């Protein structure tokens, strides 16, 4: 709201006044947690639940490999 | 800041001459174009005259009702715009307003409305 | 433009610091014991720094309780299968995003932190109500200015750090500067000289000085609010603003860039368009209903968006921003006419007004003093004939002593 | 290289303008009423602009008709749950893409617009049949050049603008110019001087002129078709092409860049590879079956892809493109040999051929004026000491007036 | 297809001729709509399995529309 | 900084080469017959090049076997979705990225499949170990070019990286502007080293990467890319210990823009505090522990957590290591500000010294000829009469007598 | 490991020593295959068939889009 703009022909330039600042000055760190489960006869449904548990265990294994290399820049 | 003050009105006998003068203060007068619009008592608005900026030739455009009788002019040295009314009729009794024509951009010979 | 003048910083350094703190022994158990009751808490680490903690997913209390007793086995209902899929999909998607971005993702996706969780975290952050309001109304910007660093997965718990931004400067006046080449308009080719203001970008008042952002592409703008990052800034004095009203001010040396490349271009501003039309290029400004409403002459001119929809330079068609605001045209002689093209430095990038004027002072010395030594070539005399008698200088020769 | 010579434009300005038109009262009701029968229609807004309109998903007639009556409540079919999930997943993913990218996404994803719907929009767009053909065969490129601006979600409808590209110039001849440093091949270290053409990028014929794209990385290629964007282009005269056949042509002043950094490099071209091998660097060209087939001499040379598979410069290994076509090698004296290293300006960015010649003519002016004038002049005549007596010149000496 | 290329040794440059143009000169805007339904609340108190799944799917729908309303509440 | 000195290369040029080979007739059948038994195989194509081959999803043996007879329970629906979702997502990733995607997503190649490809790769065990422990980085350095969908298989080539140089010493150079500290505004001159970026020993020379943003770091390991590198002599390292060495002309960049900034290094922070800017270095418990004076200074991360320059707050990296401060006079003080070339980008030490000798040459030579070129007599007035020499002027000879 | 760093005040620069190389020198190409089934049309109005039919529609539309994508390299 209530924005202006000026053009200076002498310098071939333009200034757009009327904005409000929202500068990011610093950071704040937050820790997010996801609690996992320590998991070590074929009916109709068990095959799907078994491969879904396989998805879960492979996800936690891949994350175990990923945290292996602590981030650094 | 932006102001247009017209002066020179009043009583005048039918057939003589009277010069209206519009003083501009608040913006660049040379870069902008001026217009004269009158309103008869009880009647609607009637567009009368128009003079373009110095950059676009100083071109005077009049209406059919006053063409040949009225003459628009401008004095950019003192930021003023004149409307010379010659051979006045009784129908010319009206309120005369001074307006500024707004170009389709910051500067253009195509105008979209009367700003001030 | 002046992005090379910026410093070099580490973005995730803070989150990685907290990460290395989370590797320590017992540090994870403090969090697991703190969130054993509620889902959100505030925890002070070993080094004393207090950080927010959140438990967004509990597959432990699902696999170990709702799924474990069934596992000879047999599943009785199918609804539990889809329920497990819905519970596990989030972990799967988080794993994908991490395995692609090497453990650090930005912006923060909704899988990493949903809007409900993000707004809760903003509500409990140790900042003002104004800051909570700002971060809550612009969660898309907070997501784009945040990182997600994966930390550790120890003791049956998964942990990753969300590096959130802190807006320490709010509601101070800002302005964006746009620039374009200002060249002469001669007819001969390559005879033109060009000059361009280089100080273009965002400026914001901050702590008695000005924060300057040369790469305006990195500053995000929403409504009249400007979310910039001080990491990509320069701390300049307030007198920089003088360059807009008086480029020849003595209190600040305004930065320019000189050349001889007179090409036509256009810079779309917030409320209009700047057009630099040089050479045989055709530049126009048009309205969607009537059509062309201005054909630009050779030079740098401006056109407000009030009634103009497009601006075309050469084969390029620009759509101007249709933002509502007042545009003011400030007359003035193009400063390039104040210069002599014979001593104009045409190779200047990191330049300034005074730096170019001093490079002109030297050339004026080089030509008016040293080159005028050519005048002393024919203006001096050769040796008279080494003959018997003496010679006098008459006309342009040595004509002896008959005249005697 | 010359990307700084470009202008600054607003990409979504048109879509944002249409978006702000949709915020007005009643406009949403006009759209809602037009699509009450069919799923796609053409609607002219208040400002007269006619735009295509599409309803891609109808959750209203699913939740209220097929889902509402079941909600005592109990679900009978389990298939209806999965049916609702399949219907709702698209809205969820659209929400994710918008909430991450701050409401503006590019390229346009398949969730935002499927292939059938995109081809429907292309088929119903009011442009030529050739444009329909071009956009229909290259939907991946059209997606890469399109935007998706989220507009409003008012009165039981969701609305976002899909800003599609218009290819007004099709099937005109284009060509890609590749450049590489051209340095001398002296044995001393710092004695070398370098020169490089900056005109690298894409060129296309357009409306009696040439559209030049200096950042060729932004131009996408499919088969022999080049999808560029005029937004980052320059309108040059046709005479720019002369720079390929005659760098010293008078009708166009070709842009170059001088330096002294003689480092070895390679530029993989469309049908071959340019190799600038300077110093002790070892540069070779090899075939996957036979092995090394050329050891480059010091200088800038070329190798066609006809029978060559890799080119190695130093420790860098490049794979050349195996596209089918003819490569032509045009011999010629390297122009860097035409320059004298004592008057060669080495600090030059954003230069031209005549711009180098002007500084060379200037340096030779000071040299031909200094050494040719000081030597021819050096043997002049001193004067006799000012002692109120007039001296005449005889035998190379000044003798007083000895007459009586 | 029938593509050429030339190398100029004098200037150390290469030109790849034989391509066809496809320049983007202008834009075209179209409005895509998704009709939504005004659902106040899942006015059901049951706790069986299928209602348990369908209610949380409706909650996903409602949170999605709330986020879209917050996002609408542009330029880059 | 020096990224413009790099060459231009075609990245997927190798993969596309294999890609067009698959377009030939029968070439796809060799692969389909090789993978008819197992899921992974080695195939030597027509051009003799041997490539690994992998079948990650078989919808043929599902749709034609488990799904077709019903079309000639509800679980069979979900089973199909789980099998089909990958084909959809692979499609989506392609349809956006125009057939070439990077990094290689998990849909394109899962971790198990990628580790299998690394295990059967024809390279050393050390490379297998390196690629297996850093699969996220390998994905970021790999491409996925979609090739063909021929009767009746879908095919895309995954272009994997080969690390021919491993375990050689590397080092990262950080630079920042080095200016004088005068009180007047425009009176200062600035100088900055431009050779900043990554360096690694390679084949008796040094591979230099000016765009360190492209080099990825995990622990003390640096995955760089030779395609955007420079092969420099071993002597380049001398520029760090002896900038004025004659055996290598170190590259610098001159200016007059004395602005304050900071460069966060691996174990510390460089602070260039010029002008009236206030620059500090602070600790999370103690607070401000150093107020920088005008100039370029350094502060290690040993006990420092933040560094603030002006309105900018930087967090320094809290990595463990020994940081050593090497004293020395700032070389910018070795230059005279009256003859200093201030517009230099692609510059070096010898180029600046030669422009100073040249600028100085013209002044001493112009004075050596002009001072004094007026020690000689000029031309007498060129009228009719004759002129003799008296004092400094040409006196009319007719005055005698 | 054992990482060091040095700061040179004379040139205002810093060198971070102690890292190991892992340079990408060359490429290696591998072919991934996904065998498809030649199904002409869903030849078949209960609840479960509707889902399996539109899932087959997803499959056929995916292979059709890949056919359009393959039309360029
Ligand atoms: C390459 C070259 O000739 N450099 C010269 C050097 O020989 C000379 O001694 C010096 C003046 O003392 O000026 C410089
Ligand atoms: C520069 O020029 C000004 C005026 O042209 C003159 O007064 C001055 O002496 C010159 N030299 C310096 C070093 O300022």
CA distance C373 to chain F (A): 8
Smallest CA–CA distance from D267 into chain F, residue: F8
CA distance D29 to chain C (A): 23
Q: State residue C105 phi and psi, 5-degree precision.
A: -115, 145
CB-count burial class (<10 Å; 0-12, 13-18, 19+) for B13: exposed
Q: What is the DSSP string of F335-378?
A: S-TTS----EEEEEHHHHHHHHHHHHHHHHHHHHHHTTTTSS-B
- The β-bridge partners of F296 are F272
F380 touches chain G (CB under 8 A): no
Residue F236: name the closest of A35, D203, D279 by CA. Answer: D279
Question: Which residues in chain G have Cβ-Cβ distances shorter than 8 Å to F158?
Answer: 29-32
- Are F162 and F274 part of one and the same domain? no
Question: HSE-up of F193 (CA within 13 Å, CB side)?
Answer: 28
Q: How many separate domains does chain C show?
A: 2
User: Number of helices (H) and strands (E), helices first, in chain C?
Assistant: 10, 24
Distance of alpha carbon G23 from alpha carbon F226, whole angstroms = 7
- Are C345 and C326 part of one and the same domain? no
Give the domain range for residue C358. Answer: 1-261+333-377
- Are C198 and C118 part of one and the same domain? yes
Strands G4-8 and F322-326: parallel
For residue D225 the two structure tokens come to: 């078709």
- Are C110 and C225 part of one and the same domain? yes
CB-count burial class (<10 Å; 0-12, 13-18, 19+) for D217: exposed
- Are F151 and F80 part of one and the same domain? yes
C67, C81 Cβ separation under 8 angstroms: no
E60, D81 Cβ separation under 8 angstroms: no
Distance of alpha carbon C139 from alpha carbon D158, whole angstroms = 20
Cβ contact, residue pair G47, D80, below 8 Å: yes
CB atoms within 10 A of CB F112: 12
- Are F73 and F197 part of one and the same domain? yes
- The β-bridge partners of E20 are D173, D225
Distance of alpha carbon C197 from alpha carbon C247, whole angstroms = 10
Distance of alpha carbon D317 from alpha carbon G24, whole angstroms = 10
CA distance A58 to chain C (A): 9
Residue D259: name the closest of D334, D179, D351 by CA. Answer: D351
CA distance C317 to chain E (A): 7
CB atoms within 10 A of CB C223: 12
> What one-character DSSP code corresponds to residue D23?
T
- State whether residue F159 is helix, strand or coil: strand
Question: Which residues in chain C have Cβ-Cβ distances shorter than 8 Å to A28?
Answer: 52, 125, 163-166
Interface probe with F: pick from D296, D324, D347, most Cβ of F within 10 Å? D347
For residue B22 the two structure tokens come to: 């519009």
Distance of alpha carbon C305 from alpha carbon C318, whole angstroms = 12
Cβ contact, residue pair C169, A21, below 8 Å: yes
For residue G16 the two structure tokens come to: 């971070």
**In which residue are the tokens 């009180």 written?**
F183
- Cα–Cα distances in angstroms (integers) from residue C28 to residues A31, A71, C255, D72, D354, in the given order: 10, 18, 53, 46, 69
C84, A49 Cβ separation under 8 angstroms: yes
Distance of alpha carbon F361 from alpha carbon F300, whole angstroms = 44
Distance of alpha carbon D270 from alpha carbon D276, whole angstroms = 17
Distance of alpha carbon C276 from alpha carbon D315, whole angstroms = 46
Q: Is residue D158 part of a domain?
A: yes
CA of C361 to the centre of ligand 2 (A): 6
Contacts of G27 (CB under 8 A, 6+ apart): D319, F14, F15, F159, F160, F161, F162
For residue F75 the two structure tokens come to: 């679980």
Residue C296: name the closest of C185, C178, C192 by CA. Answer: C185
Task: Identify the helix (H) or strand (E) that includes residue D89.
Answer: helix D79-100
What ligand has the least distance to the C-alpha of F360?
A: 1
A71, C150 Cβ separation under 8 angstroms: yes
Q: Is residue F400 part of a domain?
A: no
D59, D91 Cβ separation under 8 angstroms: yes
Question: HSE-up of C74 (CA within 13 Å, CB side)?
Answer: 3
Work out the angle between the directed axes of helices G47-70 and F75-97 (0-180°, nearest 10): 20
Residue D175: name the closest of D271, D266, D252 by CA. Answer: D271
**In which residue are the tokens 């995954």 written?**
F158
- Cα–Cα distances in angstroms (integers) from residue D234 to residues C314, D2, D205, D221, D267, in the given order: 8, 10, 12, 19, 24
- Are C96 and C139 part of one and the same domain? yes
Q: Is residue D394 part of a domain?
A: no
- Are C326 and C350 part of one and the same domain? no
End-to-end CA distance of chain G: 45
Distance of alpha carbon G60 from alpha carbon F87, whole angstroms = 11
F242, F262 Cβ separation under 8 angstroms: no
> What one-character DSSP code corresponds to residue F49?
-
Residue C94: name the closest of C121, C57, C124, C63 by CA. Answer: C57
CA of F356 to the centre of ligand 1 (A): 11
- Cα–Cα distances in angstroms (integers) from residue C31 to residues A35, C52, C57, C125, G42, in the given order: 11, 10, 14, 17, 54
CB atoms within 10 A of CB F67: 20
For residue C13 the two structure tokens come to: 């350094």
For residue D339 the two structure tokens come to: 């320059």
CA distance E67 to chain D (A): 7
For residue D124 the two structure tokens come to: 């119903």
For residue B53, say if its preceding peptide bond is cis, omega within 30 degrees of 0.
no
D264, D277 Cβ separation under 8 angstroms: yes
Smallest CA–CA distance from G73 into chain F, residue: F147
Q: Which chains touch F (3 or more CB pairs under 8 A)?
A: A, C, D, G
Residue C253: name the closest of C342, C350, C117 by CA. Answer: C350
A59, C87 Cβ separation under 8 angstroms: no
**In which residue are the tokens 């005279």 written?**
F336
- Cα–Cα distances in angstroms (integers) from residue B2 to residues A1, B26, C204, in the given order: 21, 4, 29
Q: CA F231, F236, F240, F246: dihedral to nearest 10 degrees?
A: -150
Instruction: Starting at the earlier edge strand, list the strands of the sheet with F251-255.
Output: F178-179, F190-193, F251-255, F344-348
CB atoms within 10 A of CB D264: 24
**In which residue are the tokens 């902008």 written?**
B32
Residue F206: name the closest of F240, F177, F252, F242 by CA. Answer: F240
Strand spans (E) along C59-117:
104-105
Cβ contact, residue pair G72, D139, below 8 Å: no
- Are D254 and D207 part of one and the same domain? yes
Contacts of C75 (CB under 8 A, 6+ apart): A43, A44, A45, A46, A49, C81
For residue B75 the two structure tokens come to: 């004095």
Q: State residue C70 phi and psi, 5-degree precision.
A: -70, -35
For residue C199 the two structure tokens come to: 């100080």
- Cα–Cα distances in angstroms (integers) from residue D28 to residues D20, D125, F246, in the given order: 12, 22, 74
CA distance D6 to chain G (A): 31
Judged by phi (left if over 0) then psi (alpha if -120 to 50, else beta), residue F53 lies in beta
- Cα–Cα distances in angstroms (integers) from residue D273 to residues D183, D288, D333, D341, F228, in the given order: 17, 16, 19, 28, 16
Instruction: Starting at the earlier edge strand, list the strands of the sheet with D265-268.
Output: D265-268, D272-277, D299-304
Q: CA D94, D96, D100, D105: dihedral to nearest 10 degrees?
A: -20
- Are F179 and F95 part of one and the same domain? yes
CB-count burial class (<10 Å; 0-12, 13-18, 19+) for A39: middle
Contacts of A15 (CB under 8 A, 6+ apart): A5, A6, A8, C175, C176, C177, C178, C244
Resolution (angstroms) stands at: 3.4
Contacts of G61 (CB under 8 A, 6+ apart): D115, D116
- Are F307 and F349 part of one and the same domain? no
For residue C160 the two structure tokens come to: 């990753």
Distance of alpha carbon F243 from alpha carbon F251, whole angstroms = 9
At CA C139, angle to CA C134 and CA C145, rounded to 5?
95
**In which residue are the tokens 């008819």 written?**
F36
Question: Which residues in chain A have Cβ-Cβ distances shorter than 8 Å to F78?
Answer: 48
For residue C124 the two structure tokens come to: 């409990």
Distance of alpha carbon D68 from alpha carbon E41, whole angstroms = 11
B31, B109, B110: residue with CB nearest C329: B31
D102, D237, D349: residue with CB nearest C141: D102
F94 touches chain G (CB under 8 A): yes
Q: State residue G16 phi and psi, 5-degree precision.
A: -105, 95
Strands G26-35 and F50-58: parallel
G69, G54 Cβ separation under 8 angstroms: no
What is the longest distance spanned by two Cα atoms in chain F?
142
Cβ contact, residue pair F229, D391, below 8 Å: no
- Are D294 and D338 part of one and the same domain? no
| Positions of chain breaks in chain G, given as the residue before each break (C to N > 2.5 Å) | 44
Contacts of F363 (CB under 8 A, 6+ apart): none
D401, D391 Cβ separation under 8 angstroms: yes
Q: Which chains touch G (3 or more CB pairs under 8 A)?
A: D, F
Distance of alpha carbon E29 from alpha carbon D121, whole angstroms = 10
> What one-character DSSP code corresponds to residue C229?
B
E26, E50, E67: residue with CB nearest C115: E67
Distance of alpha carbon C306 from alpha carbon C312, whole angstroms = 16
For residue D192 the two structure tokens come to: 């070398």
- The β-bridge partners of C182 are C195
C303, C275 Cβ separation under 8 angstroms: yes
For residue C107 the two structure tokens come to: 């912006």
G34, F154 Cβ separation under 8 angstroms: yes
Tell me the count of D-F CB pairs closer than 8 A: 158
D341, D193 Cβ separation under 8 angstroms: yes
F309, C235 Cβ separation under 8 angstroms: yes
Cβ contact, residue pair G11, F91, below 8 Å: no
């Amino acid at each position: 709201q209530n924005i202006t703009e000026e053009f200076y022909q002498s310098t071939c330039s333009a200034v757009s006044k009327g904005y409000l600042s929202a500068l990011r000055t610093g950071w704040y760190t937050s820790v997010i947690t996801i609690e996992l489960s320590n998991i070590k006869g074929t009916d109709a449904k068990v095959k799907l639940i078994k491969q879904e548990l396989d998805k879960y265990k492979n996800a936690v294994t891949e994350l175990q490999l990923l945290m292996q290399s602590t981030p650094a820049t | 800041e932006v102001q247009l003050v017209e002066s020179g009105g009043g009583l005048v006998r039918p057939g003589r001459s009277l010069r209206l003068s519009c003083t501009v203060s608040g913006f660049s007068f040379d870069d902008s174009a001026m217009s004269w619009v009158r309103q008869a008592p009880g009647k609607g608005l009637e567009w009368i005259s128009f003079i373009k900026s110095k950059t676009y030739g100083g071109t005077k455009e009049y209406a059919a009702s006053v063409k040949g009788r009225f003459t628009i002019s401008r004095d950019d040295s003192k930021n003023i715009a004149y409307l010379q009314m010659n051979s006045l009729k009784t129908e010319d009794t009206a309120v005369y307003y001074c307006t500024r024509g707004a170009p389709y951009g910051g500067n253009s010979d195509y105008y979209y409305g009367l700003d001030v | 433009f002046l992005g090379f003048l910026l410093g070099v910083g580490s973005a995730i350094a803070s989150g990685v610091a907290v990460c290395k703190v989370l590797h320590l022994e017992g540090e994870v158990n403090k969090i697991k014991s703190a969130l054993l009751s509620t889902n959100k808490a505030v925890v002070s680490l070993s080094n004393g720094v207090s950080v927010l903690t959140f438990k967004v997913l509990d597959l432990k209390n699902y696999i170990d309780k709702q799924l474990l007793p069934i596992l000879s086995c047999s599943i009785s209902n199918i609804e539990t299968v889809i329920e497990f899929q819905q519970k596990n999909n989030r972990l799967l998607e988080i794993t994908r995003e991490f395995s692609v971005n090497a453990g650090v993702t930005t912006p923060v996706s909704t899988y990493m932190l949903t809007n409900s969780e993000l707004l809760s975290l903003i509500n409990d952050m140790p900042i003002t109500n104004d800051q909570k309001k700002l971060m809550s109304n612009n969660v898309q910007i907070v997501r784009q200015q945040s990182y997600s660093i994966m930390c550790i997965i120890k003791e049956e718990v998964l942990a990753y750090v969300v590096q959130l931004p802190l807006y320490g400067v709010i509601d101070t006046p800002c302005w964006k500067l746009h620039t374009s080449p200002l060249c002469t308009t001669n007819t001969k080719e390559g005879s033109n000289i060009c000059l361009t203001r280089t100080d273009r970008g965002w400026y914001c008042d901050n702590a008695g000085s000005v924060s300057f952002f040369p790469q305006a592409e990195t500053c995000k703008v929403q409504s009249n609010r400007v979310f910039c990052d001080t990491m990509n800034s320069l701390t300049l004095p307030s007198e920089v603003n003088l360059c807009n009203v008086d480029i020849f001010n003595p209190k600040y040396d305004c930065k320019i860039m000189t050349s001889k490349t007179d090409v036509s271009s256009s810079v779309i501003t917030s409320l209009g368009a700047i057009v630099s039309c040089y050479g045989k290029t055709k530049c126009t400004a048009s309205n969607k209903n009537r059509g062309i409403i201005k054909t630009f002459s050779n030079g740098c001119d401006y056109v407000s968006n009030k009634g103009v929809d497009t601006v075309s330079v050469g084969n390029t068609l620009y759509y101007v921003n249709k933002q509502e605001g007042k545009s003011l045209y400030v007359k003035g002689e193009p400063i390039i006419n104040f210069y002599d093209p014979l001593v104009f430095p045409s190779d200047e990038f990191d330049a300034s007004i005074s730096q170019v004027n001093e490079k002109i002072n030297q050339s004026l010395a080089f030509i008016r003093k040293s080159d005028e030594l050519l005048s002393a070539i024919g203006g001096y005399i050769p040796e008279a004939p080494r003959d018997g008698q003496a010679y006098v200088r008459k006309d342009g020769e040595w004509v002896l002593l008959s005249t005697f």
